[PDB]
Design a protein around this ligand. Structure first.
Ligand SMILES: COc1ccc(S(=O)(=O)N2Cc3cc(C#N)ccc3N(Cc3cncn3C)C[C@H]2Cc2ccc(OC(=O)NCc3ccccc3)cc2)cc1
Ligand SMILES: CC(C)=CCC/C(C)=C/CC/C(C)=C/COP(=O)(O)OP(=O)(O)O
Ligand SMILES: [Zn+2]
Lengths: 315, 405
């Protein structure tokens, strides 16, 4: 009703319809630490919020006030809880309240509290009809917003809305093939629908990942997805893999290609394969290329893989 | 002839992004940061000055000292997080080896008492409902102080009640009553439970197994099952598991390859997630996983572990923090061009400590890049308070019986 940024905004201490209530000052003690020199607007709102919270006033005026208290600090979870108490006692229209949270999430998409609030609303209403399209607009503005993906996973799972997600996943991977959030979503859909054993699907997945790797060899997310899906079953269960990678080398090397080779060789040696020597030697050699030359930030890690493979595999 | 500093060496130029002639928001943005960090790195050559790395201790101290008492209205957004500010500031002061004046210790104590709820736990400020994050912060802050006054503030029976009130059928914890779940809450619960000796044999039933479901295809841990791997949640999951002694519930091999992968070839810092930007605070949440894995693998015979270095480029992290994360005015930051705050001051410094101090048994080895006065006090990688504070508090609380016995 009166916005916090209205030129006509008036402190609660100067509003007649709040004259019956004495504000409650923050109890910080004789000697405060980490004392915030609040703005006048802020301190006014919260002085009045404490008053209504203490009296547990379940009124329409308290409700409007929680709104201003949220706007000043949307991370204050005590205000939200009280607001949810008032949404119920006053029987507020939850659809107007959905409209409200949509506006505030648009503005502060990186805050847990607003997303939790929305979840409570969808749970009360049992109505996910707006969620996929709302979430998609937030993700249109920040394609990696952690809370947005979490809210999306939650809505897909709880209401079984799986049928179109994979197409969405594809649209975004098209937009940004390096978006690890989307690679994760990919795996969330597949792994909760078809699964990764359907060999037609596992095959389509691996052809897709290799093909993306071809267009952008230095993109770490494809490489991680590729490993992610096949390592389940053990990489040496796929003998064409070793050589198909060795073919991409001349025209597509990357440290990630070399490291994936080290992972294939490890699984081969683990599965007591033909040549429990020449293979380890390719491995150690490659670790060295990594520690020494091609991936030196991870020098300590490669030294340790090198050492782990010697300790395991030469008796 | 030769550069002592790894980020200034000529061969380092090769570590720049290769976008394979394919541009996306991710590459554009990553190229933007690399340009800025390159300016910082290059600025010694451009200015015709010999490089030298100084941790600006006096200036950080002034900023901390004042902040512990008073804060601008820019911290209005942390008004539900005051115990966090206590902890971030006190921990930074402890890392920098500055004594807390008794009078200050008492006022922190009294203040945390005003934040304590009568049904257990602590809220974000006086009169706010309790919540597990400020409960964790307050408890940590109280141990940093580590006097009798401080220990006595915590009301252990009620703390245990509160924790039970949040515990879920499926092993997980709510962050607060009528709030939501994530791995963060498990760690928070595990941390305060174990420091104060309130762990009962049913409290954490199912918890290790719920955390284990949060490990995903990347190797790292997400906030809840199905979610992207994230440095902050991974820290919390592993650390909660070290406390619970169920380190083994996780694929530690794929976690190791994940965390080491998040160190950026060019900047030297860590990112929080794959394909995102470097950030000073992950100097703790990501690099602090390495000591935790080191102890876990060691407790399993791994005979391949180094007896001198953690499994990341300790030197490059120090270079990143010291050259790109310091504000000349005092305090530290996410990256060049961001502004300082107490959170980044806390975790940049905690990350620096880790990168400086290696300890596995009787094997202690330090690396102090820059001037030798840079060396910080060590930090416990589970709790991120000083190892001495951890001992002193756990010892003191083992004097008492687990409530209900
Ligand atoms: C846009 O400015 C902010 C300010 C604070 C936040 S935060 O509370 O969600 N938190 C701490 C944080 C503190 C500072 C300071 N000082 C600066 C940033 C910051 N962020 C944002 C950030 C860090 N690095 C880059 N960015 C953009 C990180 C965030 C991490 C965090 C810390 C503690 C957490 O545990 C909590 O539940 N905290 C909130 C809380 C605290 C006490 C009571 C209730 C809730 C959860 C997440 C986020 C953005
Ligand atoms: C209670 C406790 C001990 C908490 C610590 C855990 C921690 C750091 C959590 C952060 C979780 C989160 C919402 C990340 C989002 O990253 P973003 O999109 O802001 O940016 P990014 O690219 O750096 O992940
Ligand atoms: Zn940060």
């Amino acid at each position: 009703f009166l916005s916090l940024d209205s030129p006509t905004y008036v402190l609660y201490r100067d509003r007649a319809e709040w004259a019956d209530i004495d504000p409650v000052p923050q109890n910080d003690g004789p000697s405060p630490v980490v004392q915030i020199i609040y703005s006048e607007k802020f301190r006014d709102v919260y002085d009045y919020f404490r008053a209504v919270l203490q009296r547990d006033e379940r009124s329409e005026r308290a409700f409007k006030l929680t709104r201003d208290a949220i706007e000043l600090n949307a991370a204050n979870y005590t205000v939200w809880h009280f607001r949810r108490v008032l949404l119920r006692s006053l029987q507020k229209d939850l659809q107007e309240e959905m409209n409200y949270i949509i506006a505030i999430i648009e503005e502060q998409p990186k805050n847990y509290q607003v997303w939790h609030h929305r979840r409570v609303l969808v749970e009360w209403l049992k109505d996910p009809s707006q969620e996929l399209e709302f979430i998609a607009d937030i993700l249109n503005q920040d394609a990696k917003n952690y809370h947005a993906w979490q809210h999306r996973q939650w809505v897909i799972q709880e209401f079984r809305l799986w049928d179109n997600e994979l197409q969405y996943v594809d649209q975004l991977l098209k937009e940004d093939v390096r978006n690890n959030s989307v690679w994760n979503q990919r795996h969330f859909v597949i792994s909760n629908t078809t699964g990764y054993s359907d060999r037609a699907v596992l095959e389509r997945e691996v052809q897709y990942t290799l093909e993306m790797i071809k267009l952008v060899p230095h993109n770490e997310s494809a490489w991680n997805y590729l490993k992610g899906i096949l390592q389940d079953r053990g990489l040496s269960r796929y003998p064409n893999l070793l050589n198909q990678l060795l073919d991409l080398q001349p025209s597509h090397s990357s440290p990630y290609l070399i490291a994936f080779l080290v992972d294939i060789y490890e699984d081969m040696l683990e599965n007591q394969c033909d040549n429990k020597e020449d293979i380890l030697n390719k491995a150690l050699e490659l670790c060295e290329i990594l520690a020494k030359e091609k991936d030196t930030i991870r020098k300590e890690y490669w030294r340790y893989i090198g050492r782990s493979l010697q300790s395991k595999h030469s008796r | 002839w030769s550069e002592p500093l790894y980020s200034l060496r000529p061969e380092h130029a090769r570590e720049r992004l290769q976008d394979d002639s394919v541009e996306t928001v991710t590459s554009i943005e990553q190229a933007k940061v690399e340009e800025k960090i390159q300016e910082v790195f290059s600025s010694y050559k451009f200015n015709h000055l010999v490089p030298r790395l100084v941790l600006q201790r006096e200036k950080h101290f002034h900023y901390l000292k004042r902040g512990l008492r008073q804060l601008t209205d820019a911290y209005e957004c942390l008004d539900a997080s005051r115990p966090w500010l206590c902890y971030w500031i006190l921990h930074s002061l402890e890392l920098l080896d500055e004594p807390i004046p008794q009078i200050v210790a008492t006022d922190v104590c009294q203040f945390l008492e005003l934040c304590q709820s009568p049904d257990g736990g602590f809220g974000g400020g006086p009169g706010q409902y309790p919540h597990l994050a400020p409960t964790y912060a307050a408890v940590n802050a109280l141990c940093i102080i580590g006097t009798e006054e401080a220990y006595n503030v915590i009301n252990r029976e009620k703390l245990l009640q509160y924790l039970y009130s949040l515990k879920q059928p499926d092993g997980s914890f709510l962050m607060h009553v009528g709030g939501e779940v994530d791995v963060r809450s498990a760690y928070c619960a595990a941390s305060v439970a174990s420091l104060t000796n309130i762990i009962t044999p049913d409290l954490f039933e199912g918890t290790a197994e719920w955390i284990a479901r949060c490990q995903n295809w990347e190797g790292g841990i997400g906030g809840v099952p199905g979610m992207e791997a994230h440095g902050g949640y991974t820290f919390c999951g592993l650390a909660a598991l070290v406390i619970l002694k169920k380190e083994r519930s996780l694929n530690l091999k794929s976690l190791l390859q994940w965390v080491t992968s998040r160190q950026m070839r060019f900047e030297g810092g860590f990112q929080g997630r794959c394909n995102k930007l470097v950030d000073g605070c992950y100097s703790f949440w990501q690099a602090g996983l390495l000591p935790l894995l080191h102890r876990a693998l060691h407790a399993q015979g791994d005979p391949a572990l180094s007896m001198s270095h953690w499994m990341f480029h300790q030197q490059a992290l120090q270079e990143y923090i010291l050259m790109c994360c310091q504000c000349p005015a005092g305090g530290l930051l996410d990256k060049p061009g961001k502004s300082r705050d107490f959170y980044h001051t806390c975790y940049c410094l905690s990350g620096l400590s880790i990168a400086q101090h290696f300890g596995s048994g009787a094997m202690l080895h330090d690396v102090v890049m820059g001037v030798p006065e840079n060396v910080l006090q060590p930090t416990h990688p589970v709790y991120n308070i000083g190892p001495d504070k951890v001992i002193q508090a756990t010892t003191h609380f083992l004097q008492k019986p687990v409530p209900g016995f």
